[PDB]
Amino acid sequence: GGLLLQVIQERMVYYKGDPTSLDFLTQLFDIVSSDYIGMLNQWLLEGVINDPFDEFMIREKRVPDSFMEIFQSKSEYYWNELFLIKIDGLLNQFQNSTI
């Protein structure tokens, strides 16, 4: 899934001094990451998660139908528990509690 960015970044350490190889790897990383930037931009600009592949780090989860009436009354737990951060897919930039 989102592990590709980690592989490219790990791969890019060895070719950090090679101009052509670094240019190609940087171009590939830039184009590949564009979807992730789209998800992040929509999340921070409109507060909407769009792509249903569960790729994005901010995991909004659906309430089960069996508990719909319960969660509607106690909206605090809906808005505090059913939004999570998927730690596996985070880059080192976001590996900070305050961010």
Place this chain on the structure above:
Amino acid sequence: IEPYYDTLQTILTYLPYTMLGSDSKIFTFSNNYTRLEIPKDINNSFSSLLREVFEFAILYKQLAIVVDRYKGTLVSAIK
């Protein structure tokens, strides 16, 4: 002079393949590409001349080995 002088244009046929650091029917590398054996049927003069020409082949082979070995292994940017 042909009747009175015996030695193996045939050299130039197989020389390009040796110059590019590759094995040849009449020239064979050995000992991890550190020495090159000049065959029999190459009299003194031609062998002495080739010993100068083959300096490029062995040196280039060593450089190619280094380049292929350390292509993406070294971490330091300078190297």
